[PDB]
mmCIF file of C-alpha atoms in Angstrom:
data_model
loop_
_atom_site.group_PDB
_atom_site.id
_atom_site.type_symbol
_atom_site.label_atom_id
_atom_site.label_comp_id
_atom_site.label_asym_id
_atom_site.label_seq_id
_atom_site.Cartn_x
_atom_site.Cartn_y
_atom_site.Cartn_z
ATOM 1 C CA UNK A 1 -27.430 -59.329 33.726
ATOM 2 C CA UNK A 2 -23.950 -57.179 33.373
ATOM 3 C CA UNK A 3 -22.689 -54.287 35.418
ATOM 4 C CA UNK A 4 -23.572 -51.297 35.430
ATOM 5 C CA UNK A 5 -21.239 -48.244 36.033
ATOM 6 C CA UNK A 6 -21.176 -44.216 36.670
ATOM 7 C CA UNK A 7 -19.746 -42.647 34.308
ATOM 8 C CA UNK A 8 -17.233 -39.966 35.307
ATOM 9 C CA UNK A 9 -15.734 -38.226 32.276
ATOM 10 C CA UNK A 10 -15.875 -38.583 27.911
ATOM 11 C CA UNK A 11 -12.826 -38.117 25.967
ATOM 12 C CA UNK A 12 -13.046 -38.611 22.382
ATOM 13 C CA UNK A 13 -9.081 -39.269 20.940
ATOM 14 C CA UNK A 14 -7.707 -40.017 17.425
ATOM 15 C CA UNK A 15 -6.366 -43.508 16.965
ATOM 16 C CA UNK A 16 -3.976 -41.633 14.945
ATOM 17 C CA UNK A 17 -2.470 -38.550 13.499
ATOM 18 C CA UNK A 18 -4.992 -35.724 14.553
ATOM 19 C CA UNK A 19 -9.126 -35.267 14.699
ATOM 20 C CA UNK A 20 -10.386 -32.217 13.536
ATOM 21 C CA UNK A 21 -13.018 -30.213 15.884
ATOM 22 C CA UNK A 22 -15.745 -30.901 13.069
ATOM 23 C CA UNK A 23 -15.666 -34.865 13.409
ATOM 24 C CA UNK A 24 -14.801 -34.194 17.386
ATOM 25 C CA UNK A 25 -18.277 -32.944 17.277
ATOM 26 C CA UNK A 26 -20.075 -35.401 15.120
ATOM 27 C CA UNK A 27 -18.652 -37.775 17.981
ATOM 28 C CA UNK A 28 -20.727 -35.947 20.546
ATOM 29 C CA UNK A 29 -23.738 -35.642 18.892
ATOM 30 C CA UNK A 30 -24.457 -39.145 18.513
ATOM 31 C CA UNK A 31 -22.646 -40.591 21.986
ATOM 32 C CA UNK A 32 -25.471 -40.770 24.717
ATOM 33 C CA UNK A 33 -22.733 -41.796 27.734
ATOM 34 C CA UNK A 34 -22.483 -38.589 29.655
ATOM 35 C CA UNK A 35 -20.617 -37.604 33.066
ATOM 36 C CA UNK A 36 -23.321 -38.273 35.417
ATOM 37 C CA UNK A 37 -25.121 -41.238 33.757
ATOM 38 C CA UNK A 38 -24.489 -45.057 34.390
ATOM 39 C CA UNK A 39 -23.514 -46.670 31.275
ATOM 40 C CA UNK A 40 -23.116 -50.637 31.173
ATOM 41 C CA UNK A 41 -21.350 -52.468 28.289
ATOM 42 C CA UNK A 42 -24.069 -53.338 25.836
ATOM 43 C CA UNK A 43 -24.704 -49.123 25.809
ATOM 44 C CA UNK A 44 -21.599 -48.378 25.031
ATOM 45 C CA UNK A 45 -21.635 -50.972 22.091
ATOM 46 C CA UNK A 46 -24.680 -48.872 21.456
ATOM 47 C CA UNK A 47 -22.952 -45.679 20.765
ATOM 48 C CA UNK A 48 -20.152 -47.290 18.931
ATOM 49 C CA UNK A 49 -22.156 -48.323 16.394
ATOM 50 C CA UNK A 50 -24.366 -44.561 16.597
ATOM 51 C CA UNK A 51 -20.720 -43.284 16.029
ATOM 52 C CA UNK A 52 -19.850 -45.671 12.668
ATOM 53 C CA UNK A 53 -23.234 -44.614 11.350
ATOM 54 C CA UNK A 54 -22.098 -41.251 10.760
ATOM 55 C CA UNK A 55 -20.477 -42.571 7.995
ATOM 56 C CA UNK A 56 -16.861 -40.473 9.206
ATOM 57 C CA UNK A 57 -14.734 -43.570 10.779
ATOM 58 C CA UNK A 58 -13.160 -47.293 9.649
ATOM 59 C CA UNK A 59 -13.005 -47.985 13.469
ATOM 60 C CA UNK A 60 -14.119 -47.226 16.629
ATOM 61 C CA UNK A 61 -13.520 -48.081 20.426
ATOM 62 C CA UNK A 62 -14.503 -47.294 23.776
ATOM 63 C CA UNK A 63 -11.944 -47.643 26.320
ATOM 64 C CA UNK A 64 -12.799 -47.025 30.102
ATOM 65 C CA UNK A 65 -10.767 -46.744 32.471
ATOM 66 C CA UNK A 66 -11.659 -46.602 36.651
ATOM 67 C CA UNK A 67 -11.596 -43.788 38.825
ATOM 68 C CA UNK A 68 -12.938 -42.813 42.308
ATOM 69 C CA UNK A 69 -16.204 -40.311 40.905
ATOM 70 C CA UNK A 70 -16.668 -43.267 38.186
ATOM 71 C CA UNK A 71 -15.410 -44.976 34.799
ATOM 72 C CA UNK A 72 -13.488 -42.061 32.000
ATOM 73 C CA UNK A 73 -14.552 -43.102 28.561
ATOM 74 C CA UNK A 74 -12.433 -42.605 25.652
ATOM 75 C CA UNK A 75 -13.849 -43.098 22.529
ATOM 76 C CA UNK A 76 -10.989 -43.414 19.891
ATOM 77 C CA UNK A 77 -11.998 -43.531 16.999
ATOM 78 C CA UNK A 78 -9.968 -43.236 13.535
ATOM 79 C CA UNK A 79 -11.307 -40.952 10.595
ATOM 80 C CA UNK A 80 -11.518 -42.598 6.882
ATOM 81 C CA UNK A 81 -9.256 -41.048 4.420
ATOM 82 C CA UNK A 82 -10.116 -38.254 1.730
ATOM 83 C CA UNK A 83 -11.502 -39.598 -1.316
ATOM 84 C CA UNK A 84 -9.416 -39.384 -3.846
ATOM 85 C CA UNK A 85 -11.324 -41.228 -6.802
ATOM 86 C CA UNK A 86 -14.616 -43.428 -6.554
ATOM 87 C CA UNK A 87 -13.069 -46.745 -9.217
ATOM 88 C CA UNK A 88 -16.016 -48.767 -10.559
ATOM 89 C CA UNK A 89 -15.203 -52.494 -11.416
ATOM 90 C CA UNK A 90 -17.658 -54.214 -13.552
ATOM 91 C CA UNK A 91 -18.595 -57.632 -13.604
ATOM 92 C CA UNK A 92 -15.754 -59.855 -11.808
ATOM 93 C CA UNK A 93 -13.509 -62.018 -12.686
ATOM 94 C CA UNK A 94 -15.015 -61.725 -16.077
ATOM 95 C CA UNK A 95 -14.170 -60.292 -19.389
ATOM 96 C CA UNK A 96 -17.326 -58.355 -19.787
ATOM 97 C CA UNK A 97 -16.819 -55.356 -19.140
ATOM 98 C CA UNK A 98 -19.249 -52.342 -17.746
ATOM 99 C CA UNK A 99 -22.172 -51.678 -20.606
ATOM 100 C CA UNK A 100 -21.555 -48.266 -19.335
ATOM 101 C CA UNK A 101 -19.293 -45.471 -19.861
ATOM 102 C CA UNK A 102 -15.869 -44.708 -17.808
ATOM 103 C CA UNK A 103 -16.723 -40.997 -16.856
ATOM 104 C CA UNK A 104 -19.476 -42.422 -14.645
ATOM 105 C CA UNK A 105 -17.732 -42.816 -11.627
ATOM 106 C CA UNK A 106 -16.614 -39.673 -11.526
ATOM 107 C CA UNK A 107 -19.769 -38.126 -13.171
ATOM 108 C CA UNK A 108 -21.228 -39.254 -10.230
ATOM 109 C CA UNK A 109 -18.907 -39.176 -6.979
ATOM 110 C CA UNK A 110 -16.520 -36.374 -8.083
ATOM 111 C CA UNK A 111 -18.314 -33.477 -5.882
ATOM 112 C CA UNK A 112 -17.116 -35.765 -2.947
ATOM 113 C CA UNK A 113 -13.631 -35.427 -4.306
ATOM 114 C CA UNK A 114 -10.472 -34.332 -1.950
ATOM 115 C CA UNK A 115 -12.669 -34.559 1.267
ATOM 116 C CA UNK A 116 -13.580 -36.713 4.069
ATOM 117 C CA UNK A 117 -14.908 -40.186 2.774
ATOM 118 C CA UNK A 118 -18.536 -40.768 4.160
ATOM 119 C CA UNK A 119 -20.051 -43.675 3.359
ATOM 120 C CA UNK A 120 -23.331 -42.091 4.107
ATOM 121 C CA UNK A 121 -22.785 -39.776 0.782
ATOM 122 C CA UNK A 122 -21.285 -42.498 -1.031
ATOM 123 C CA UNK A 123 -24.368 -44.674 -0.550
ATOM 124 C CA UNK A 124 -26.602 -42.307 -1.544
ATOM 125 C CA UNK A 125 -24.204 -41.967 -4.907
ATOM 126 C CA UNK A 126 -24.565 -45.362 -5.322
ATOM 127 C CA UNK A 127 -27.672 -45.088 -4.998
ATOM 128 C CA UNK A 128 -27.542 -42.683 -8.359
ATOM 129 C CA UNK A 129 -25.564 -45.286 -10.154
ATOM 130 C CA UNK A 130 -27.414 -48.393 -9.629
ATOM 131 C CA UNK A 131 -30.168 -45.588 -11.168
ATOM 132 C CA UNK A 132 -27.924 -44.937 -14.283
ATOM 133 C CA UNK A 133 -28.050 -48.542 -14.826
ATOM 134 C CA UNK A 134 -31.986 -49.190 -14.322
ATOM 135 C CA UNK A 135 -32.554 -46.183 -16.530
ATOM 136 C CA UNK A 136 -30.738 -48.065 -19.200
ATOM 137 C CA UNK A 137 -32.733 -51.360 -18.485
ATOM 138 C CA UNK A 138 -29.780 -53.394 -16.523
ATOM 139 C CA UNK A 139 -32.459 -54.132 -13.889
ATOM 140 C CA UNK A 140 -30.127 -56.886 -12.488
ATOM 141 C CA UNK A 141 -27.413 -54.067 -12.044
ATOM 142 C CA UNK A 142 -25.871 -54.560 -8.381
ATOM 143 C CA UNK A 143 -23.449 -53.422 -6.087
ATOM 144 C CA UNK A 144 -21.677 -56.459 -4.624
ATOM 145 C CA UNK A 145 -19.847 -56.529 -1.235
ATOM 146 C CA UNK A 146 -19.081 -53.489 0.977
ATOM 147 C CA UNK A 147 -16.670 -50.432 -0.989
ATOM 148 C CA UNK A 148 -13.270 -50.944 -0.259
ATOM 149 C CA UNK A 149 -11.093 -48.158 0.683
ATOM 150 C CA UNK A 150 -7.542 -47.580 0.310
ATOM 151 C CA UNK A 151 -4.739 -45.780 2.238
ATOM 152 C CA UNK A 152 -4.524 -43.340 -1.220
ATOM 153 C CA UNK A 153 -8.392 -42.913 -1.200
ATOM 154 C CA UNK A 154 -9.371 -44.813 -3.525
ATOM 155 C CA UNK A 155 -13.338 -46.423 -3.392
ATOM 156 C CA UNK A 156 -13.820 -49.439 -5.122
ATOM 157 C CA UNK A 157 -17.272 -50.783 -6.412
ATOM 158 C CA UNK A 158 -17.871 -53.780 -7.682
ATOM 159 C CA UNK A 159 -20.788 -54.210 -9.597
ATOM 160 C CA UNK A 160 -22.211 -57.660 -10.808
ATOM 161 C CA UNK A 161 -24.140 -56.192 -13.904
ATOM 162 C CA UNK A 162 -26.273 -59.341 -14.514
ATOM 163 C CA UNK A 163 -24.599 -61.739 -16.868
ATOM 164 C CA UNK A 164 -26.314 -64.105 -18.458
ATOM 165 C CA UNK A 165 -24.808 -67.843 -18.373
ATOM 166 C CA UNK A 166 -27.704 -70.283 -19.782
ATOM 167 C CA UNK A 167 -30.438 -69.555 -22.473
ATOM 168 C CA UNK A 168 -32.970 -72.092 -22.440
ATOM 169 C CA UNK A 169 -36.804 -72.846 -23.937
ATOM 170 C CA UNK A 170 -39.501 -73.854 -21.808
ATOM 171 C CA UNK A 171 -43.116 -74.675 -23.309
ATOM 172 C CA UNK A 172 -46.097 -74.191 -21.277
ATOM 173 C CA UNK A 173 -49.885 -74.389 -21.825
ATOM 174 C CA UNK A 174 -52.351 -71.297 -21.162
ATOM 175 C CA UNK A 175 -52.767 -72.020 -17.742
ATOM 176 C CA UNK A 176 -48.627 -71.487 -16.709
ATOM 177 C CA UNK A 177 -48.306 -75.264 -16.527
ATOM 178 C CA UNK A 178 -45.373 -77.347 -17.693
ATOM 179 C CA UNK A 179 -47.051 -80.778 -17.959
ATOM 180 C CA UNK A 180 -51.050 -81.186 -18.934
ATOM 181 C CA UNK A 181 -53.971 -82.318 -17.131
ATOM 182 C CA UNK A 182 -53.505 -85.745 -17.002
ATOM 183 C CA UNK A 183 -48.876 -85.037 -15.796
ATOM 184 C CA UNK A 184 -47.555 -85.429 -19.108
ATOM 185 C CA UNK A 185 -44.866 -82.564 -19.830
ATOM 186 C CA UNK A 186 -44.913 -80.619 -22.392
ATOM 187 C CA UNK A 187 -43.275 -80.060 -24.841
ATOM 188 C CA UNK A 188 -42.709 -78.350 -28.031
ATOM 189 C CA UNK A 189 -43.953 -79.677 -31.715
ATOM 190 C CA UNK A 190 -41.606 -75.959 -32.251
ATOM 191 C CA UNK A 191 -37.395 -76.387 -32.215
ATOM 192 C CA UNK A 192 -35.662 -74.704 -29.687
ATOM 193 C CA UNK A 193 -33.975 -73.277 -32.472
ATOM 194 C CA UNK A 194 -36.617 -71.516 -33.999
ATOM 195 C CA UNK A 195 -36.990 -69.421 -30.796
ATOM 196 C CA UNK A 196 -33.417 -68.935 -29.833
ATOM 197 C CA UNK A 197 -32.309 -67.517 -33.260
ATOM 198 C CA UNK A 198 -34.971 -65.042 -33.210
ATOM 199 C CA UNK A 199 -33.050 -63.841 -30.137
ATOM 200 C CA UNK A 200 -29.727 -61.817 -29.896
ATOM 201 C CA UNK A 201 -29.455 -62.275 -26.304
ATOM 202 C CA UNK A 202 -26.319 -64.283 -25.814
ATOM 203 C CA UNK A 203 -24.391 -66.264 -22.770
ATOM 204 C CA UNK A 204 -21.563 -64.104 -21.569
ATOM 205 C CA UNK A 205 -23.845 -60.947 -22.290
ATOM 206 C CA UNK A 206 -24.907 -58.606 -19.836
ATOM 207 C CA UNK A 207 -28.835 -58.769 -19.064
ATOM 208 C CA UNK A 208 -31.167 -56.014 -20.332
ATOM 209 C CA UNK A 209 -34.451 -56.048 -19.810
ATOM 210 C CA UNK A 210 -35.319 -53.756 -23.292
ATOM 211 C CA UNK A 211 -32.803 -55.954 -25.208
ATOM 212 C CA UNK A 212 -34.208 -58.726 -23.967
ATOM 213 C CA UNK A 213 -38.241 -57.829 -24.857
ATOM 214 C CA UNK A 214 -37.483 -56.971 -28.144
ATOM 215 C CA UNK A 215 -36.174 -60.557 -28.700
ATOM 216 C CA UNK A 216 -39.385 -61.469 -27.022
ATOM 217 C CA UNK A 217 -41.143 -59.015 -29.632
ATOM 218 C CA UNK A 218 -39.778 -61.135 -32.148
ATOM 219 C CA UNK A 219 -39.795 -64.684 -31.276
ATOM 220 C CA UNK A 220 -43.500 -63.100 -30.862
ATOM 221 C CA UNK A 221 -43.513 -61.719 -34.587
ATOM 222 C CA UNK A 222 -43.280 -65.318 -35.802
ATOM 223 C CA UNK A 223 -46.390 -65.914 -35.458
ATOM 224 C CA UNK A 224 -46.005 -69.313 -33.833
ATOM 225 C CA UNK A 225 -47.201 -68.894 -30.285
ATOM 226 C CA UNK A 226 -49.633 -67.150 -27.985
ATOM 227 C CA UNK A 227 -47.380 -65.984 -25.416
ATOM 228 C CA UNK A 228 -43.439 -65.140 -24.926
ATOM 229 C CA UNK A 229 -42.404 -64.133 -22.011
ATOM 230 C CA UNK A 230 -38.881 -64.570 -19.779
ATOM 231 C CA UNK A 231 -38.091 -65.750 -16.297
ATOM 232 C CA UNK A 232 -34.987 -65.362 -14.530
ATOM 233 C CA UNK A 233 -33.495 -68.262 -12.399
ATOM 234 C CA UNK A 234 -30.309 -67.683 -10.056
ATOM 235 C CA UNK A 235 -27.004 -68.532 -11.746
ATOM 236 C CA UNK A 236 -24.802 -72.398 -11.008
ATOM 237 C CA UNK A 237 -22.717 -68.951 -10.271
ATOM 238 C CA UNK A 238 -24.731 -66.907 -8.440
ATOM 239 C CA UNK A 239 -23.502 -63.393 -9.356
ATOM 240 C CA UNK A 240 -24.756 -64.567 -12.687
ATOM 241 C CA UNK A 241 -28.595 -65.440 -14.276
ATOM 242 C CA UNK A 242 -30.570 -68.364 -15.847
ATOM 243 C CA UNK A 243 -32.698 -66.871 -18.583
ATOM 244 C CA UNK A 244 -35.414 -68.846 -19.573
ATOM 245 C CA UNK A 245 -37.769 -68.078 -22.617
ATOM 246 C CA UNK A 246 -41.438 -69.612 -21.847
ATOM 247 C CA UNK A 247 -43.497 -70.146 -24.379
ATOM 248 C CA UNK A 248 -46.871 -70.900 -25.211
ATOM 249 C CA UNK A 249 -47.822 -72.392 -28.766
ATOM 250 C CA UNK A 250 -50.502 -71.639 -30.682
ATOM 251 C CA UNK A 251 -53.318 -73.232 -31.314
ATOM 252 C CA UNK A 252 -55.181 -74.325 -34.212
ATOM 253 C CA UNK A 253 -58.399 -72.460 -32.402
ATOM 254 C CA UNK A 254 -56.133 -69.152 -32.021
ATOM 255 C CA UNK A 255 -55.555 -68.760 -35.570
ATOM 256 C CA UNK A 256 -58.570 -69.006 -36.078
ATOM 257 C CA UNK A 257 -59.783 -65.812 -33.475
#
């Protein structure tokens, strides 16, 4: 239980420099304390947060102060810059850089440009751009952290692509095992290197799902197994993937049909 307290009057300030009357009024339309209406702590935590989810503000605060008719609340509240350019930064602190093109960015945030930054638009631009990259088959393609925002404007992304750090070869049987029916493992009467050099996929190299299938279409066009597929397994660094080609090997039976 907390106290509970009339409320007497809302003011909505800047932290500082000035507030226009358009974010003034996003302000009201999400606040719920009134003149009139009690209000206790954990509601006006409430409408802070209703106030940051309009995507307009990097902070927010409610500061009451006592009166005889009740408590004044003054939401202060400081607006986010203008965006001045949306920066994308691909795969950190690594030398690969994006797979994609520079002009993306901007292909993608710049009708945002020289106004108000709202993360609600830039979210749903990411939203485009994680697109770009799933369109292209970099299905591990990810936005990492929350955007950072500078005093200039600036919006920086960083996006863990999906960089590959192991390659390995597992054999299975039919059944999706790894050892038989009486616990032995299995293994290959196949090298590892016959499978890995049918593949171009590489450590250091940026995951891609059609890449990567038509290296399983040829480890496949060997003729030496029944199935190829991949797994993925969480990298030692976890930004980074495992890749793991699983393999099944042929029997005498199967070429046979």
């Amino acid at each position: 239980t907390e106290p509970r307290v009339l409320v007497s009057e809302v003011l909505v300030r800047p932290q500082s420099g000035q507030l226009t009357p358009e974010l003034e009024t996003q302000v009201y339309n999400v606040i719920r304390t009134q003149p009139g209406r009690t209000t206790t702590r954990s509601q006006l935590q409430e409408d802070i947060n209703a106030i940051f989810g309009t995507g307009f503000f990097s902070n927010v605060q409610a500061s009451p102060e006592d009166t005889p008719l009740g408590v004044r609340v003054s939401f202060i509240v400081q607006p986010n810059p203008v965006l001045s350019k949306v920066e994308i930064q691909a795969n950190p602190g690594t030398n690969v850089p994006s797979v994609l093109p520079q002009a993306t960015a901007d292909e993608i945030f710049r009708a945002q440009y020289g106004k108000i930054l709202n993360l609600r638009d830039l979210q749903e631009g990411i939203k485009e751009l994680t697109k770009r990259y799933q369109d292209q088959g970099y299905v591990l393609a990810n936005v990492v952290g929350a955007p950072q925002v500078s005093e200039n404007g600036v919006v920086t992304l960083q996006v863990a692509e999906g960089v590959v750090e192991n390659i390995s070869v597992r054999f299975r049987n039919k059944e999706g095992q790894d050892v038989n029916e009486q616990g032995q493992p299995i293994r290959g009467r196949t090298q590892d290197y016959i499978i890995t050099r049918e593949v171009e996929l590489k450590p250091g190299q940026v995951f891609n799902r059609n890449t990567v299938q038509k290296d399983l279409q040829r480890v496949f066009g060997t003729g030496l197994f029944e199935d190829v597929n991949v797994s993925l397994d969480p990298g030692t660094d976890p930004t980074k993937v495992n890749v793991v080609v699983n393999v099944v090997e042929r029997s005498l039976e199967h070429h046979h049909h």
